Amino acid sequence: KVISQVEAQRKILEEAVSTALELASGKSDGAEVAVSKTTGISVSTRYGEVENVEFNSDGALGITVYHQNRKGSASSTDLSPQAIARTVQAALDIARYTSPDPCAGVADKELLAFDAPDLDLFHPAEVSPDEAIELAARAEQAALQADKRITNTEGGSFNSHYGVKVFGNSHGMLQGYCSTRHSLSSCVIAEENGDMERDYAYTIGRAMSDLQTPEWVGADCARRTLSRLSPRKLSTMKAPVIFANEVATGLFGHLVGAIAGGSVYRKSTFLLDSLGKQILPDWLTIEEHPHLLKGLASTPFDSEGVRTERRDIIKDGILTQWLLTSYSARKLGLKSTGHAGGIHNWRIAGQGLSFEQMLKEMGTGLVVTELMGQGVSAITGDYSRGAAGFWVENGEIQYPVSEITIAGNLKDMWRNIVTVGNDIETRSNIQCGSVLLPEMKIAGQ
Amino acid sequence: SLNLVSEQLLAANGLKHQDLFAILGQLAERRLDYGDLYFQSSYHESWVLEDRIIKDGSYNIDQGVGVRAISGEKTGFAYADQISLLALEQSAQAARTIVRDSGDGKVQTLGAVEHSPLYTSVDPLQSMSREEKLDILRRVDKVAREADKRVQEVTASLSGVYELILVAATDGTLAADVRPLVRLSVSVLVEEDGKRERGASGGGGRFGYEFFLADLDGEVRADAWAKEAVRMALVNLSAVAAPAGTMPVVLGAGWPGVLLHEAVGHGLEGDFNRRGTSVFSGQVGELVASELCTVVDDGTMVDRRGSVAIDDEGTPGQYNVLIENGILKGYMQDKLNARLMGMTPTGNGRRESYAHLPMPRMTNTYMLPGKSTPQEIIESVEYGIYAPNFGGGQVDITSDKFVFSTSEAYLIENGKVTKPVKGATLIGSGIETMQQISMVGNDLKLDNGVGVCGKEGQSLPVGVGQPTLKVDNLTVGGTA
Ligand SMILES: CCCCC[C@H](CC(=O)NO)C(=O)N[C@H](C(=O)N1CCC[C@H]1CO)C(C)C
Ligand SMILES: [Zn+2]
């Protein structure tokens, strides 16, 4: 039945885009309009009882217009015809006061997804609040009952939403798509000898039937939380570092900002001179897969309506391309690569070792499992972040560690990766296993 | 303000006082401790200069209603991006489903009370011409570029928000606010012999854009900040590797008050303490910081970015002493957590918008000044770091571990500030770090009006402050 609510919403959104474009058309050289609507439920439990029930409904329309290469933008959450009219007028008025900028404008017609692919992103569920509560409660209760050292809770949580997005522009593109996301988590607190620790586990997917069970979530939550108890603060040292899979994804994630066209044309990236250079090991390829069916970050077009493409961003260690949008492409004398709004599923294969085998290879060193702070310079690659994780000796985890930092430079870190594990994290945009680096500076006692 | 806001949010949308009664009544059909209606309309603009031209401008509008039903620990919540009777009815009928049992229906009569004005009700978007606003950005560009030949790029942005809110609750609260907020941000890139670095400055508060053209220590504020961004960039360009490990750290006055925001601020929000999940839970009356430390959260500061004439529950902003001479005095609250803890609202019940739940949140968090001069503090260090500016920070309130990352820092060698060092993340335990504060300066200042605090995905304008202070032992995430 929810399919009908979504199809009604989609028709309304399509009409809102067409209305906005027509209102802009006689007064601008170009215009781009995006609208979205997201609806669903978010629930939490505390000690297995309902805590919060939140009903979500968010809508939005944005327009950008261009005249004499001058741009103006406006947005509204109200999608009434009169609100749309006011929004269009506001953008047009702004464009009288901004300066001509020839790199600005609607994306090139030759790059637009006029006939956008169906990526099967929409798997709705009629989950009632009571059903949502029971899933959250089950996850939380499974964590709480795992071990008597679990003495408090931050709850179970369940989220289920559907979305409709429509984009159009003055080249005649008008395409939209629907999507869903569902997730289930729990987060509990353990104590030992006057030390409290918190950790969490979760499952996420586009279809409810892709989720791990509540009991799986709770068991993982408890396992992770209990593993943090009674940490040591390491002494200041140099040692090898494994980025556990869950933070290894973020290690590769820093690449996005460093090869973004916006950073490149402004010369504000440490990789400015690295296009076609080997910045990673010669066996390492980062594959982008924007059209994976049901993919967590799949998209049929970027935020400027540009087609998304299968590309090897890194191929055998070599940086093959920048991540360009229409504006940054134009600054560089290039064409958009369909990266307005970010990256669309990165995949990095393992090199054959399990996490356990990686511990044995390293022998002695630090496993980082959680990082804190920004501490990454876009312009130099300098890296300094707070860390928690585990000390490893004799190829075995010895004790958890916290209240330490890890420091280095991304250029050196990336180039000298020893291996990547087969323990792939599969809940994220970037998916990879654990990553072994030969040395970082660890600050501590 | 209440009559003006009521005319704009209620009367203009076909609503009367008696509709408020009807909707609160619908909530009170259920067995609730509390219910509220939160109305909002807001207007945001931004303008950006880059490559010596006005590149971009935006105008963004939002409005809506949010409705909560609360019973003990429990909150039902629904909202709509429109202010209408139907939106209110739909939202109340969803929110009240948090409990099935009938209530007695006994609500308190709605009645507004006065609160102290903390900022103008004049709309900052309409109070200066567009070309005058753009002239602010043009002057920032010219000043930054003239400051040093190595300046190659300048991005300067101006943003302004005008927001009306009204809140009505089953406990009789009826209150409104009119909230202006403006911000100027400047980013510069410097280049020398193929080496590049960046610097930033800016600020603002709850007033019109004229503030950026007003005098700051004998110069035009915009000009002073343009020069500061360049200065920061050039320092960073010259910086060498930071040392690694535990050492004394002297923090500058102002924005380095991120220390307090992370080390104690979030940990003293009442939601975590009511649940027992904060390291500070049950520690009222204990020594949680050195005896030189008195930390306040102050929502009452005229014109400041982080202030709240009323919070989002209608509670007027307060000067709340959290830590007094090292002793924990209490927590920041919202109405839910105050009731559960047997305490009272403190003026810390804040929500990002009508589309989000309020929770306990900071306003302006700062440490009171002490007796030491900043020079005396620097002179006390044989080897360590002086960090007069930071980026951001983060805390885990359960394990009591926090970080914050330098944006300008120097070695101290033999009681003198010497070489600039590269950005480093500093890490410590909150309580243990506060207990290591051995000198507190006589030079309190707050940040320029730049802070955004995040909690549970909700961003808010928040201030920090402190004098210069010395932390005897803190772990510095350098490489050297
Ligand atoms: C009042 C907030 C104090 C700083 C802490 C916050 C994050 C936070 O809420 N931590 O608990 C932050 O880093 N905010 C940053 C921040 O506000 N900054 C970073 C540099 C200056 C200022 C500019 O907005 C960014 C990430 C938004
Ligand atoms: Zn914060």
Nearest chain A CA: its distance from B302 CA (Å): 31
The answer to whether A97 contacts chain B (CB < 8 Å) is: yes
Strands B319-324 and B327-328: antiparallel
Nearest Cβ partner for B75 among A52, A97, A104? A52
Residue A404 CB neighbours (<10 A): 27
Q: Nearest-CA neighbor of B270 among B173, B362, B378? A: B362
Separation of CA B84 from chain center: 31
- Greatest CA span in chain A, whole angstroms? 73
Q: Which helix (H) or strand (E) holds A50?
A: strand A49-67
Contact list in B for residue A95 (CB cut-off 8 A) is: 57
The answer to whether B165 contacts chain A (CB < 8 Å) is: no
Give the 3-state secondary structure of residue B428.
strand
CA of B265 to the centre of ligand 2 (A): 8
> Is there a contact between A77 and B198 if contact means CB atoms under 8 Å apart?
no
B80 backbone dihedrals φ, ψ, rounded to 5°: -150, 145
Q: Nearest-CA neighbor of A124 among A164, A157, A175, A167? A: A164
Q: How was this structure determined?
A: X-ray
Q: Which residues contact A12 (CB under 8 A, 6 or more apart)?
A: A79
Q: Nearest-CA neighbor of B371 among B235, B470, B264, B248? A: B470
- How many contacts (CB atoms, under 8 Å) link A and B? 224
* Residue ranges of A 146-185 with Cβ closer than 8 A to chain B: 152-154
Tokens of B431: 């309580």
Q: Which atom of ligand 1 is nearest to the CA of B464?
A: 1
The answer to whether B125 contacts chain A (CB < 8 Å) is: no
CA of A71 to the centre of ligand 2 (A): 34
C-alpha to C-alpha distance for B75 and B27, rounded to whole angstroms = 12
Contact list in B for residue A58 (CB cut-off 8 A) is: 81, 355
Residue A49 CA neighbour count, 13 Å, CB half:
8
The answer to whether A236 contacts chain B (CB < 8 Å) is: yes
- Block residue for tokens 């994976």: A292
Name residue B402's beta-bridge partners: B395, B428
DSSP characters over B350-390? E-SSTTS--EE--SEEEEPP-SB-HHHHHHT-SEEEEEEEE
- Greatest CA span in chain B, whole angstroms? 77
The helices-and-strands tally (H runs, E runs) of chain A is: 9, 17
Nearest Cβ partner for B197 among A58, A379, A388? A379
Q: Ligand 1: which of B308, B453, B460, B464 to mutate, judged by most atoms within 8 Å of the beta carbon?
A: B453
C-alpha to C-alpha distance for A143 and A226, rounded to whole angstroms = 10
Q: Which helix (H) or strand (E) holds A196?
A: strand A195-205
> Is there a contact between A267 and B478 if contact means CB atoms under 8 Å apart?
no
Contact list in A for residue B79 (CB cut-off 8 A) is: 55, 57
Long-range CB contacts (within 8 A, 24+) of B415-419: B415/B378, B415/B379, B415/B380, B415/B381, B415/B382, B416/B378, B416/B379, B417/B378, B417/B386, B419/B239, B419/B240
Tokens of A189: 């607190």
C-alpha to C-alpha distance for A256 and B314, rounded to whole angstroms = 43
C-alpha to C-alpha distance for B172 and B116, rounded to whole angstroms = 19
Tell me, what amino acid is at B348?
N
Residue A256 CB neighbours (<10 A): 17
B33-57 as b/e: b if 16+ CB within 10 A: bbbbbbbbbbbbbbbbbbeebbbbb
Tokens of A326: 């229409």
Measure the CA angle with vertex B475, ends B473 and B480; round to 5°: 120
CB-count exposure of residue B111 (10 Å: 0-12, 13-18, 19+)? exposed
Q: Which residues contact A118 (CB under 8 A, 6 or more apart)?
A: A177, A300
Tokens of A269: 């990236």
C-alpha to C-alpha distance for A213 and A139, rounded to whole angstroms = 8
Task: Judge contact between B463 and A428, C-beta under 8 A.
Answer: no
Separation of CA B406 from chain center: 19
Long-range CB contacts (within 8 A, 24+) of B62-65: B62/A76, B62/A77, B62/B353, B63/A77, B63/A78, B63/B354, B64/A77, B64/B39, B64/B40, B64/B353, B64/B354, B64/B355, B65/B37, B65/B38, B65/B39, B65/B40, B65/B91, B65/B354
Contact list in B for residue A38 (CB cut-off 8 A) is: none
- Judged by phi (left if over 0) then psi (alpha if -120 to 50, else beta), residue A333 lies in left
Q: Name which of B351, B427, B433, B473 to mutate to probe chain A: the one with the most chain A Cβ atoms within 10 A of its Cβ.
A: B427
C-alpha to C-alpha distance for A187 and A139, rounded to whole angstroms = 9
Contact list in A for residue B357 (CB cut-off 8 A) is: 52, 54
Nearest Cβ partner for A375 among B82, B97, B405? B405
**Which residue is closest to A441 within chain B, CA to CA?**
B479
Task: Judge contact between B109 and B30, C-beta under 8 A.
Answer: no
> Is there a contact between B399 and A77 if contact means CB atoms under 8 Å apart?
no
Secondary structure of B379-391 as H, E, C letters: HCCCEEEEEEEEE
Contact list in B for residue A90 (CB cut-off 8 A) is: 59
C-alpha to C-alpha distance for A13 and A164, rounded to whole angstroms = 8
> Is there a contact between A441 and B244 if contact means CB atoms under 8 Å apart?
yes
**Could you tell me where the beta strands, DSSP code E, fall in B51-173?**
53-71, 74-80, 151-169
Nearest Cβ partner for B425 among A49, A402, A405? A405
The answer to whether A398 contacts chain B (CB < 8 Å) is: no
Task: Judge contact between A129 and A53, C-beta under 8 A.
Answer: yes
Tell me, what amino acid is at A328?
S
Nearest Cβ partner for A404 among B134, B394, B427? B427
Which protein residues are within 6 Å of ligand 1, measured from CB?
B 258, 261-262, 266, 391-395, 450-454, 462, 464
The answer to whether A89 contacts chain B (CB < 8 Å) is: no
Take atom 12 of ligand 1 and give the residue whose Cα is closest: B392
Take atom 11 of ligand 1 and give the residue whose Cα is closest: B394
Task: Judge contact between A168 and A17, C-beta under 8 A.
Answer: yes
C-alpha to C-alpha distance for B310 and B165, rounded to whole angstroms = 10
Q: Which helix (H) or strand (E) holds B336?
A: helix B335-341
CA of B266 to the centre of ligand 2 (A): 6
> Is there a contact between B424 and A99 if contact means CB atoms under 8 Å apart?
no
Task: Judge contact between A144 and A189, C-beta under 8 A.
Answer: no
| Domains (range + CATH), chain A | 1-231 (3.30.2290.10), 232-445 (no CATH)
Q: Which helix (H) or strand (E) holds A152?
A: strand A150-169
Contact list in B for residue A152 (CB cut-off 8 A) is: 275-277
Q: Nearest-CA neighbor of A414 among A321, A280, A244? A: A280
C-alpha to C-alpha distance for B316 and B155, rounded to whole angstroms = 37
Resolution for this PDB entry, in angstroms:
1.5
CB-count exposure of residue B116 (10 Å: 0-12, 13-18, 19+)? exposed
Name residue B177's beta-bridge partners: B165
Residue A241 CA neighbour count, 13 Å, CB half:
28
**Alpha-carbon separation of residue B364 from A283, B313, B473 (angstroms):** 51, 18, 26
Residue B221 CA neighbour count, 13 Å, CB half:
17
Give the 3-state secondary structure of residue B437.
strand
Nearest Cβ partner for B78 among A55, A86, A373? A55
Task: Judge contact between A312 and A288, C-beta under 8 A.
Answer: yes
The answer to whether A59 contacts chain B (CB < 8 Å) is: yes
Give the 3-state secondary structure of residue B198.
strand
Q: Which residues contact B160 (CB under 8 A, 6 or more apart)?
A: B44, B45, B46, B124, B125, B180, B181, B182, B183, B209
The answer to whether B196 contacts chain A (CB < 8 Å) is: yes
Task: Judge contact between B451 and B366, C-beta under 8 A.
Answer: no
C-alpha to C-alpha distance for A267 and B196, rounded to whole angstroms = 8
Contact list in B for residue A49 (CB cut-off 8 A) is: 73-74
C-alpha to C-alpha distance for B330 and B270, rounded to whole angstroms = 9
Residue A145 CB neighbours (<10 A): 13
